[PDB]
Amino acid sequence: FDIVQVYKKFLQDDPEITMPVAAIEALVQLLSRSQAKTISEFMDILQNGSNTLKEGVQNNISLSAGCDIFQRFVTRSLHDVGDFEQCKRHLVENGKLFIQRARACRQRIAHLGYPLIRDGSVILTHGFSRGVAAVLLAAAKRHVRFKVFVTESRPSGSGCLMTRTLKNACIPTCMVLDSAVSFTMNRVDLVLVGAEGVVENGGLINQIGTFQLAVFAKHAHKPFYAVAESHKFVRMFPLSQYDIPFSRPILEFDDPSPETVHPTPSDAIHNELIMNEEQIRNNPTLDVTPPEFVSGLITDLGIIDSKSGVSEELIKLYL
Amino acid sequence: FDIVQVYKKFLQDDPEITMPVAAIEALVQLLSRSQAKTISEFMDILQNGSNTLKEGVQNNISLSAGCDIFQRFVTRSLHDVGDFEQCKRHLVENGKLFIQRARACRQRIAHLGYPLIRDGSVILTHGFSRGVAAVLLAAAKRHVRFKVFVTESRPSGSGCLMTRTLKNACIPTCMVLDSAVSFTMNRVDLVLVGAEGVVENGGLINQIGTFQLAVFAKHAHKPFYAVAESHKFVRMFPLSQYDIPFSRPILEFDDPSPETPTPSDAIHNELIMNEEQIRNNPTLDVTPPEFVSGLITDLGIIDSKSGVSEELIKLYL
Amino acid sequence: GPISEFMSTINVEHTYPAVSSLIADLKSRKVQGPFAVAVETALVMRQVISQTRWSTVDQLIDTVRAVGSTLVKAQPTEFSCGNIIRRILRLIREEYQELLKTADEMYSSMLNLLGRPRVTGGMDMRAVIISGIQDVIDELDKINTDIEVQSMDHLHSNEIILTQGCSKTVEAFLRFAAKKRKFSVIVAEGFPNNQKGSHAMAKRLAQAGIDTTVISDATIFAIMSRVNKVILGTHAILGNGGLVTYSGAQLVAQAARHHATPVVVCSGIYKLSPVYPYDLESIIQLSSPDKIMSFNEGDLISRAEILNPYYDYIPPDLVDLFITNLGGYPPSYLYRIMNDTYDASDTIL
Amino acid sequence: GPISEFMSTINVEHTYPAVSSLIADLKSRKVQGPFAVAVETALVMRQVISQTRWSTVDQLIDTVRAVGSTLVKAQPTEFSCGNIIRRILRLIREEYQELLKTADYSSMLNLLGRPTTGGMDMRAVIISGIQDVIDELDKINTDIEVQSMDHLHSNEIILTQGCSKTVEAFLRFAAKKRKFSVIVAEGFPNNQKGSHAMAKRLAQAGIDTTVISDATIFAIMSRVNKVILGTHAILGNGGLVTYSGAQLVAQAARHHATPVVVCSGIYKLSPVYPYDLESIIQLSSPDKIMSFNEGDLISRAEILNPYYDYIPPDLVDLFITNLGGYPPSYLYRIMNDTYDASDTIL
């Protein structure tokens, strides 16, 4: 039983499942083949499986949020009276119920999201994100007149998939380069992004370009909303926009002692002159967005502005 | 006479020339082949010639600056009991002896700029700039130990050319995506950019990713220095960082009617925008003077940036 | 789900005469303002509970929820109405739920995701429901009393306080500290809508022994440099912590932020509404052009657009401290305060 | 290009005894602080112009530049010295150019245009201009203190740090008519003794003075109307080289939206661009912040005592100078009308 390729095995099979939920499901798959001998070790095989899952995935913040929720659930139910097998029984049966519950989350997020978009407004988005689309698509189903700027998200280039999705819903879209984002702010009425995880202070962990949009937005005095499920809330506190675990070593220079081997008109469009995959791996994949740049967090629990509210939920979680 | 063809001509003639100077040389070799001899005839001239020049190149700001300098030199010594011809030869005579200083201005800049880089510091630059390169190279010869982040500068892709330019001088380099510039600011000690033109209030007109760097620099409390020759000063006052003459129509939307999964670690270089889309994105942005620490010129380092205004004040009477 | 569907209006009348009468006075805006609306709503609800008979608890809840719904849509920007409704709804559920415990023999929202999927439901809960309602009406009458006492922690001698318009809560706050401490208050008139009210309050502040200065709204920025604290009243506090307040307050708040001057807000918790300000265009109300431009100016009014909004909006980030009858709290903690006073289901009425 | 070349040591000693004695006292920190260095340098220059013999203006210029280069190197963070030099260097140059043609605009237009007995016994004239500097260096406190009736008003609260004869003269002048208050943050460890003495003198003038620790600066800042600071020097980018802890006042002021006013004579304005702060900030002895008799502590810990503090140009709101009140953006034009922008590097 390999939990890593099982946690993987939940992601390509279901396009609309979230990494923390997939991690939860992967842990359920573990407890079904558990055959634990005592309670002390119903917890450590749960421990061992959770840890080795975290080590086997490069960006592990999102799934760890799920792993957190899961072991805390188990611990809390076992503390009370501790029939570790009813617990097992419970999870395994209501396993797929957890998946549909998660789908219900995003749907409720969308219903809270679309009233934010009003008639004749313009929306900016960074890359592709389930939920961001869900909010936008839901707004379109109510026949609301609005247009959407989308950013190509180097390296993932998720922007193309996102704008295809949006005009597949017959909504007008215009793609914008990562370097040209700030210039478009005077035309933007609202910025809307998604999140891989939400840290304790209500900050956002998402793909590389998000924090850039957050600053441009605050500078242009444009509202900046994020879309995240409550199970993406993780108990961890980055002390900066740069304080997260790195999967592979990034931002390092070469050391050129020895020779070789060996102007742009600024109107020239040279798509061949993009960075190669090797030096792209030398760049960060993720990005931290401090809460003072976030107008509101659109969750299944409602729209959270407090940025002590995400902390409040994490508090109630761990006691 | 196809002045435009000429103007482009220098540009390829000599990589180290500046767009304003190339416009000045343009007007000179028009002033050579210009039969003229009426001030009415004499001064009807370029104006249709820089006008024709201004309308002939789509992004025209930099050449407009070199233009603006030229005529103000013309009328100011045509005023003064001014005879035509003595300026007509003197401009055509010393045309070679113009792209002299223009080249000497850049070196003057580099000799002023390079001490801003001190031992063990990390520099961040956006795209390719001859002035920035000049400063960095001049510091390198003095055996100064420093490293440079270079932004992959879409659409121009100038990041590659600048990276290789600096690699040749044994300067440690590292390329960053336009979306990762903010994440790198904590490792950056100083940000250094060039500018195609400097507006009246001391603001910068440059490549489309420039203002974003200045924004990240302000937020990360890091010095932001601009590198531009004096003849890039142009009298025009953008009321916003969005207010510039647009070459092509820009940022306009689709009109769809019922018209009939990606991880973050994934690297899809084949998932970029096409050039049809890129021609809908801007080529340049504007950087407000409150984001510019100091403006390195051949006139010295201008920190006031009511001082760029002072120079344009002197230029016009 | 309003009350029209449940029953014909003709007998939301003879069965609920107070409701139809309140709806009328709410639309015509004869009963206006947070406090007046709150009291009248609670009173109407009392005679509703008094006369309604709903034998399983769900008939009560559905009744009050539906009746409260039409009261809400009568005048949607008087959020104090809906707040009273939400209080009474939680009053019933919790009380009944407590009653449920009585027969014998969540705690996280995140944790729930992994959660797992009445007897003698009762009427004649009226005694306790009417009790709690009468309580609420009383607790509304004590807002000024236990708010003004907190002035001794924020109002000190020889300080200069900037306020705008007229607020009985703010006025009480000032005068309570004024008995023992002599300070100064600059009152910005709330032109054109809170003009007379503030001019009247300013006179009483002077009579209370407070160095009172009356200024036009344009003068707000000019005097901000010598102001220690901004003390504002509010019409309502929305879900995100934003302020639905009276026009001109944005001038004060913006000028205060610019001069790094603290903004304090004195308000009862009954003005705290869970509704989220999705569109400010629906929140700001506009009164008559009459208050700004005179009607006998025929040529001007025919050739110009005259706009008189009497509500302003303050984003929650411009408020440093909320002075409430529950105590002093940051805008951040308003989140939990709503969770403790309202059931989440009643956010949309 | 110093004077160690173009002249021997013994030649310097004999020809320019003042230069030798100034070099020694600049290195030994005998002559110290902007004013003392300004006056002494100007007097030493009067000797240089009196003694030196030349037939060409250029010989005079480079002779002065060489003496300047040497005096500067003696104590480089006393910018006052070089400024006096650069002042005289310009004084020489245009006394020359009007003598040049009694015998009869923009730098942007220089890109397009024309390419390509003078020096001796203008000495008598040069010496006069040097005396003109001496006179102006005396009127600094008087030309500045008068402006206090436009900024200092009754019942205002003012924050100051360390000691500044300029700021003191500024305060007390307004204080002989108007009644206000001054909070004096001592300049511990360096400006400590001096600030206490100034605080007493202020109170004796009836200015209601409060002496606080440096850690109290933020706490009282909320009640302060105005910050009035002195400075050691004003650099090329409009920045401020000032005494220790002054950024505490600056940062706290910006955080409380309190205006920062700087009182300084123009002579403290130096064209030296701060390419660095490390070379700018000098470090005094650790004795000032830690007693040497703490044997265990001083052998086990790095103990640092900066003499100066730097303040970025955009943290000053107003400069009160002998010429008048000016915004930081105008310092650019103040220099180009005072120094010659080739003597920036001496």
Side-chain angles (χ1 to χ4, degrees):
Chain A
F1 179 81
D2 179 334
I3 185 167
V4 181
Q5 262 95 22
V6 161
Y7 161 76
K8 292 207 182 73
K9 197 62 210 313
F10 271 91
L11 289 176
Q12 49 288 344
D13 291 346
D14 201 343
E16 65 179 348
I17 198 175
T18 48
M19 291 175 55
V21 168
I24 293 176
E25 294 298 321
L27 293 172
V28 173
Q29 289 273 352
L30 177 74
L31 291 190
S32 62
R33 311 191 190 285
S34 64
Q35 294 180 59
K37 327 160 294 298
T38 207
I39 299 95
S40 166
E41 56 225 350
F42 176 68
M43 295 296 305
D44 58 33
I45 184 53
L46 171 55
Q47 178 66 241
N48 197 343
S50 178
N51 288 338
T52 187
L53 171 54
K54 294 174 175 177
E55 331 181 305
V57 188
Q58 266 205 5
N59 288 285
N60 56 271
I61 307 300
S62 286
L63 61 93
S64 64
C67 296
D68 281 9
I69 296 183
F70 191 82
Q71 233 195 47
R72 179 60 178 163
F73 176 87
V74 174
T75 299
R76 188 166 181 175
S77 294
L78 293 192
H79 156 281
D80 191 35
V81 279
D83 188 22
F84 66 105
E85 293 177 350
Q86 176 83 8
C87 200
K88 161 174 154 318
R89 276 175 176 48
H90 170 10
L91 306 172
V92 196
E93 332 180 330
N94 296 273
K96 253 214 85 138
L97 176 54
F98 304 154
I99 306 185
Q100 190 97 15
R101 276 209 228 272
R103 289 181 177 150
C105 286
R106 179 180 296 137
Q107 198 177 349
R108 189 170 298 107
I109 293 181
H111 280 88
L112 293 166
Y114 81 88
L116 267 173
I117 308 169
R118 273 326 179 69
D119 197 32
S121 63
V122 182
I123 313 299
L124 177 65
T125 309
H126 180 72
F128 167 74
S129 170
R130 313 157 293 183
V132 176
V135 165
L136 292 166
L137 300 186
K141 213 201 75 174
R142 276 72 167 180
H143 294 83
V144 179
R145 311 195 283 188
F146 69 96
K147 321 155 187 326
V148 175
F149 281 106
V150 187
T151 79
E152 61 151 51
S153 292
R154 306 292 311 281
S156 64
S158 309
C160 296
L161 298 85
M162 181 63 186
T163 176
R164 247 284 176 159
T165 301
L166 290 171
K167 64 182 178 181
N168 280 18
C170 310
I171 230 54
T173 50
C174 167
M175 291 197 66
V176 174
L177 301 153
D178 285 317
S179 52
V181 176
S182 71
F183 191 88
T184 74
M185 276 303 184
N186 63 344
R187 302 175 180 263
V188 170
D189 286 322
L190 178 145
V191 185
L192 187 54
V193 306
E196 289 195 0
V198 183
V199 288
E200 189 88 36
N201 52 317
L204 306 174
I205 296 189
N206 201 244
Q207 60 172 331
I208 187 55
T210 57
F211 167 68
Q212 310 211 154
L213 273 76
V215 183
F216 304 153
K218 191 149 183 290
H219 175 70
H221 306 97
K222 310 291 183 168
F224 183 92
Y225 295 94
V227 170
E229 285 89 301
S230 64
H231 52 249
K232 295 200 245 182
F233 294 176
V234 59
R235 172 149 278 188
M236 64 173 299
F237 198 106
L239 292 174
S240 64
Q241 331 153 314
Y242 327 95
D243 187 20
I244 39 180
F246 300 154
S247 63
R248 63 178 64 87
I250 53 176
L251 301 185
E252 47 192 3
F253 305 85
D254 43 36
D255 187 23
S257 170
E259 329 204 338
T260 330
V261 128
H262 158 255
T264 305
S266 73
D267 221 335
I269 307 174
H270 297 178
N271 295 27
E272 77 278 358
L273 283 178
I274 46 93
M275 288 166 57
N276 58 55
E277 156 158 345
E278 187 195 9
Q279 60 196 177
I280 283 188
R281 290 176 296 181
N282 197 33
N283 291 17
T285 50
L286 292 187
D287 194 24
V288 188
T289 305
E292 67 269 9
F293 288 103
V294 181
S295 297
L297 194 60
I298 311 175
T299 71
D300 40 320
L301 312 186
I303 301 185
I304 303 176
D305 191 341
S306 174
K307 296 316 176 308
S308 80
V310 179
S311 186
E312 285 182 40
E313 286 300 326
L314 289 158
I315 290 166
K316 294 164 183 172
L317 173 69
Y318 295 92
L319 218 58
Chain B
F1 174 40
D2 244 321
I3 190 162
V4 175
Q5 329 247 148
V6 184
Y7 162 80
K8 308 225 192 170
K9 282 242 178 212
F10 287 79
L11 286 192
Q12 333 65 44
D13 69 337
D14 188 38
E16 27 192 354
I17 201 174
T18 59
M19 292 178 54
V21 167
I24 302 174
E25 294 295 335
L27 306 170
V28 157
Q29 224 67 43
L30 193 147
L31 230 66
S32 174
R33 308 193 20 163
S34 4
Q35 319 121 356
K37 322 327 195 195
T38 76
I39 58 113
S40 80
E41 213 221 356
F42 187 25
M43 278 183 344
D44 281 343
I45 60 24
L46 29 70
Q47 195 86 32
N48 272 297
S50 176
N51 293 140
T52 308
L53 180 50
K54 289 169 181 178
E55 318 175 325
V57 187
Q58 283 188 314
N59 254 326
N60 50 85
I61 292 89
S62 292
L63 63 91
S64 180
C67 282
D68 285 17
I69 287 189
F70 188 92
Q71 319 92 14
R72 264 304 301 186
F73 172 64
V74 168
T75 177
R76 182 194 151 178
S77 30
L78 261 57
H79 180 200
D80 77 8
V81 316
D83 64 317
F84 326 154
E85 96 275 357
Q86 237 187 16
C87 273
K88 182 209 235 157
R89 35 191 168 138
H90 165 42
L91 288 183
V92 179
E93 293 184 315
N94 310 135
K96 155 148 211 137
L97 178 26
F98 289 147
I99 292 187
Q100 291 295 100
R101 288 157 178 154
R103 297 241 203 90
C105 281
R106 175 175 297 119
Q107 243 217 330
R108 178 73 175 116
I109 286 178
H111 285 296
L112 284 168
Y114 85 88
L116 277 175
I117 303 95
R118 233 160 85 253
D119 200 75
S121 62
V122 179
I123 321 294
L124 168 70
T125 174
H126 172 67
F128 168 79
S129 173
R130 304 180 285 261
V132 174
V135 171
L136 294 176
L137 293 184
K141 165 179 147 13
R142 272 74 159 183
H143 300 291
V144 181
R145 309 187 289 190
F146 68 96
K147 327 197 153 177
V148 175
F149 281 114
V150 182
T151 76
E152 170 195 319
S153 185
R154 316 210 61 221
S156 71
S158 303
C160 305
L161 307 179
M162 172 58 74
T163 310
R164 195 173 330 164
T165 296
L166 293 177
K167 185 186 292 179
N168 297 342
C170 297
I171 296 175
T173 59
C174 174
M175 298 203 61
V176 295
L177 296 156
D178 289 312
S179 49
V181 194
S182 64
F183 192 88
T184 62
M185 282 308 303
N186 68 327
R187 303 191 181 191
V188 174
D189 289 276
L190 188 145
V191 185
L192 197 65
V193 304
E196 297 183 14
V198 173
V199 305
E200 177 73 44
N201 60 85
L204 317 171
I205 305 183
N206 203 27
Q207 299 185 8
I208 194 46
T210 294
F211 172 62
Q212 307 198 164
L213 267 80
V215 150
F216 299 149
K218 189 78 177 302
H219 172 82
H221 302 100
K222 303 303 179 63
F224 185 87
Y225 291 101
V227 173
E229 296 85 345
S230 176
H231 51 264
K232 283 168 169 178
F233 297 178
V234 54
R235 174 149 284 193
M236 63 181 304
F237 215 113
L239 291 182
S240 66
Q241 71 249 60
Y242 322 106
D243 183 28
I244 43 180
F246 296 153
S247 54
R248 310 169 49 88
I250 183 191
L251 290 178
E252 288 173 305
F253 279 105
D254 279 336
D255 198 344
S257 77
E259 189 38 19
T260 325
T262 312
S264 61
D265 196 327
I267 308 177
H268 293 2
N269 268 329
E270 78 284 348
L271 256 57
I272 67 184
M273 300 168 58
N274 60 67
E275 330 197 337
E276 165 93 345
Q277 295 174 313
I278 290 178
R279 287 192 300 267
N280 196 24
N281 282 169
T283 60
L284 311 169
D285 59 12
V286 187
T287 297
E290 59 257 16
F291 294 86
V292 178
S293 309
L295 176 52
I296 310 175
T297 66
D298 50 283
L299 267 55
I301 302 187
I302 303 178
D303 285 88
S304 170
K305 268 177 299 306
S306 69
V308 179
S309 180
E310 291 192 53
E311 291 305 320
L312 292 186
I313 283 165
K314 297 188 181 304
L315 196 159
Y316 297 83
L317 297 190
Chain C
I3 204 50
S4 303
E5 175 258 337
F6 272 147
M7 318 137 34
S8 264
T9 73
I10 170 61
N11 277 331
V12 77
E13 269 276 8
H14 295 127
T15 55
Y16 301 135
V19 176
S20 272
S21 184
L22 178 55
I23 293 182
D25 283 323
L26 275 178
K27 295 153 98 63
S28 69
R29 286 180 50 83
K30 166 183 166 185
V31 47
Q32 64 170 45
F35 190 80
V37 166
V39 174
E40 281 294 310
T41 291
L43 289 175
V44 164
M45 285 306 101
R46 190 181 58 188
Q47 265 223 23
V48 161
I49 301 298
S50 139
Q51 241 205 345
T52 301
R53 181 177 181 170
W54 61 91
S55 14
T56 83
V57 63
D58 285 21
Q59 286 80 338
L60 189 53
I61 296 184
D62 285 27
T63 312
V64 184
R65 173 177 304 201
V67 171
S69 179
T70 57
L71 276 189
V72 162
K73 318 222 184 61
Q75 193 57 259
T77 51
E78 297 278 356
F79 308 90
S80 53
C81 179
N83 292 342
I84 296 304
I85 304 297
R86 295 179 182 95
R87 291 207 63 183
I88 303 176
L89 285 180
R90 178 165 175 148
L91 200 167
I92 302 163
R93 311 221 206 42
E94 313 267 302
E95 155 36 60
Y96 155 101
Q97 243 187 348
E98 167 263 34
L99 197 24
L100 220 63
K101 275 175 175 264
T102 69
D104 285 314
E105 307 246 64
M106 173 151 271
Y107 289 81
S108 153
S109 262
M110 290 196 47
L111 214 31
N112 266 359
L113 187 91
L114 278 47
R116 316 157 317 179
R118 265 326 73 167
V119 182
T120 350
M123 186 175 282
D124 217 340
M125 289 199 259
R126 293 182 183 174
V128 53
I129 300 307
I130 295 188
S131 171
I133 286 181
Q134 178 64 46
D135 296 1
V136 167
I137 305 174
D138 292 333
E139 330 207 42
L140 284 175
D141 268 318
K142 336 250 187 188
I143 47 172
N144 286 12
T145 305
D146 43 37
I147 274 186
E148 64 187 354
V149 299
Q150 310 174 57
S151 61
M152 293 299 188
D153 295 335
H154 305 291
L155 288 187
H156 293 261
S157 299
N158 296 86
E159 280 193 338
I160 292 186
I161 308 303
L162 174 63
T163 191
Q164 195 200 219
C166 47
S167 174
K168 302 293 292 181
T169 302
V170 167
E171 183 179 346
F173 195 82
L174 296 175
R175 298 173 70 177
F176 186 92
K179 291 162 335 188
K180 294 177 179 177
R181 304 178 184 176
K182 307 226 141 178
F183 50 92
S184 301
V185 167
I186 301 182
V187 177
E189 57 165 33
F191 190 81
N193 308 311
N194 316 134
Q195 190 184 18
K196 154 175 296 268
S198 59
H199 282 222
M201 178 200 62
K203 188 182 72 69
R204 297 194 296 275
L205 286 177
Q207 293 170 182
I210 305 180
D211 195 308
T212 295
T213 305
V214 175
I215 65 168
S216 53
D217 291 278
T219 325
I220 290 176
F221 189 97
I223 47 93
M224 202 72 236
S225 61
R226 311 291 261 104
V227 176
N228 294 113
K229 291 165 175 49
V230 156
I231 296 182
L232 292 185
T234 186
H235 168 78
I237 310 173
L238 300 184
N240 72 329
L243 299 193
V244 177
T245 176
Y246 302 94
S247 71
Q250 183 85 343
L251 299 182
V252 173
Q254 289 296 335
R257 180 63 47 172
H258 193 256
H259 294 233
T261 302
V263 171
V264 199
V265 178
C266 301
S267 179
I269 32 74
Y270 73 99
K271 299 183 186 177
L272 189 54
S273 183
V275 287
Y276 191 86
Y278 283 109
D279 197 346
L280 292 177
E281 286 284 315
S282 61
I283 286 164
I284 281 79
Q285 297 303 129
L286 278 69
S287 180
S288 182
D290 182 43
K291 302 287 170 293
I292 294 186
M293 176 68 68
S294 184
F295 184 78
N296 61 312
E297 283 286 341
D299 291 337
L300 293 198
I301 66 180
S302 59
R303 299 166 180 168
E305 177 173 273
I306 293 86
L307 306 173
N308 177 33
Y310 59 89
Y311 286 154
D312 215 336
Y313 175 79
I314 313 298
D317 296 341
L318 292 196
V319 176
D320 293 280
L321 177 65
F322 282 102
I323 293 292
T324 68
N325 48 315
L326 267 52
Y329 301 106
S332 155
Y333 187 70
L334 288 180
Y335 175 78
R336 182 170 293 250
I337 295 186
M338 283 195 303
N339 287 8
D340 289 28
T341 53
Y342 305 140
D343 289 324
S345 68
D346 311 329
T347 43
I348 296 186
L349 227 40
Chain D
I3 204 64
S4 69
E5 317 176 290
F6 300 77
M7 283 179 66
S8 75
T9 298
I10 185 60
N11 201 338
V12 163
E13 285 275 356
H14 284 327
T15 315
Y16 303 133
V19 171
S20 300
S21 57
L22 182 53
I23 291 168
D25 293 336
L26 278 174
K27 291 180 177 302
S28 70
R29 302 287 278 148
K30 180 174 181 179
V31 282
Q32 200 176 358
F35 194 84
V37 178
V39 169
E40 208 68 274
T41 293
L43 296 177
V44 167
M45 285 311 105
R46 188 165 66 183
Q47 200 194 68
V48 167
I49 300 305
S50 75
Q51 292 296 280
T52 298
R53 230 142 42 161
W54 64 99
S55 8
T56 297
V57 52
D58 302 19
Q59 330 203 275
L60 180 61
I61 292 298
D62 292 332
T63 305
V64 174
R65 292 182 102 272
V67 177
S69 172
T70 300
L71 284 180
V72 162
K73 188 207 171 187
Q75 195 54 259
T77 49
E78 290 280 3
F79 305 87
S80 187
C81 182
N83 300 346
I84 291 297
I85 308 289
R86 295 176 247 260
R87 181 79 180 281
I88 297 187
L89 277 173
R90 165 155 178 174
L91 176 74
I92 295 179
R93 284 194 184 89
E94 63 184 343
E95 172 57 40
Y96 172 76
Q97 288 204 354
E98 229 152 47
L99 281 188
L100 178 90
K101 304 191 186 182
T102 36
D104 68 9
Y105 294 161
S106 70
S107 302
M108 303 195 53
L109 291 172
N110 289 342
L111 182 62
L112 272 57
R114 202 66 168 197
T116 188
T117 196
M120 190 118 179
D121 203 329
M122 50 175 182
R123 155 187 300 158
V125 180
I126 302 292
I127 296 296
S128 170
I130 296 185
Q131 192 70 39
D132 283 28
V133 168
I134 317 287
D135 304 334
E136 183 178 2
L137 290 185
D138 283 330
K139 284 173 45 182
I140 49 145
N141 272 10
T142 66
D143 288 19
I144 288 181
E145 70 186 352
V146 172
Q147 312 190 35
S148 64
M149 303 292 290
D150 278 84
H151 304 291
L152 288 178
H153 300 267
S154 296
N155 307 113
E156 286 187 3
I157 296 184
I158 311 299
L159 182 66
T160 317
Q161 196 202 230
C163 50
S164 176
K165 299 269 182 53
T166 306
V167 168
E168 182 176 350
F170 186 84
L171 295 181
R172 299 174 65 177
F173 180 78
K176 73 192 322 220
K177 291 230 150 204
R178 302 173 183 178
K179 279 238 178 291
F180 55 98
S181 306
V182 170
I183 303 182
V184 179
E186 59 177 22
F188 188 83
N190 297 11
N191 302 35
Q192 181 180 37
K193 157 188 171 183
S195 50
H196 289 200
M198 181 194 66
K200 199 163 184 174
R201 278 191 297 277
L202 293 182
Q204 287 167 357
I207 316 182
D208 198 313
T209 314
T210 303
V211 192
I212 66 175
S213 173
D214 288 276
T216 315
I217 288 176
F218 190 96
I220 53 97
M221 199 68 239
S222 60
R223 290 270 174 84
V224 181
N225 290 99
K226 224 168 304 180
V227 160
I228 299 180
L229 291 188
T231 186
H232 176 74
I234 311 175
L235 297 195
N237 74 329
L240 253 62
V241 181
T242 173
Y243 307 101
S244 51
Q247 203 185 72
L248 291 179
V249 179
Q251 303 285 6
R254 181 64 69 178
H255 186 277
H256 289 242
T258 305
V260 172
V261 157
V262 172
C263 295
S264 172
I266 290 299
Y267 81 96
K268 307 190 190 190
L269 183 54
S270 178
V272 174
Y273 193 92
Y275 290 99
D276 179 21
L277 278 61
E278 290 275 329
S279 61
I280 293 296
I281 300 300
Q282 290 292 114
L283 273 72
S284 178
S285 177
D287 178 46
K288 297 290 179 299
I289 80 175
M290 174 80 78
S291 178
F292 181 78
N293 71 341
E294 293 270 5
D296 284 335
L297 293 187
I298 70 176
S299 64
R300 289 164 167 164
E302 200 194 53
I303 304 184
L304 310 171
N305 177 30
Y307 201 99
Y308 299 109
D309 203 343
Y310 173 85
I311 297 179
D314 49 270
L315 283 197
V316 174
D317 297 276
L318 181 69
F319 282 102
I320 296 297
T321 70
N322 46 269
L323 303 182
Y326 303 96
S329 67
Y330 194 71
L331 295 183
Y332 189 85
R333 197 180 195 89
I334 301 287
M335 306 214 87
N336 297 16
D337 298 27
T338 301
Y339 310 131
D340 181 299
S342 72
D343 308 338
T344 67
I345 170 62
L346 218 39

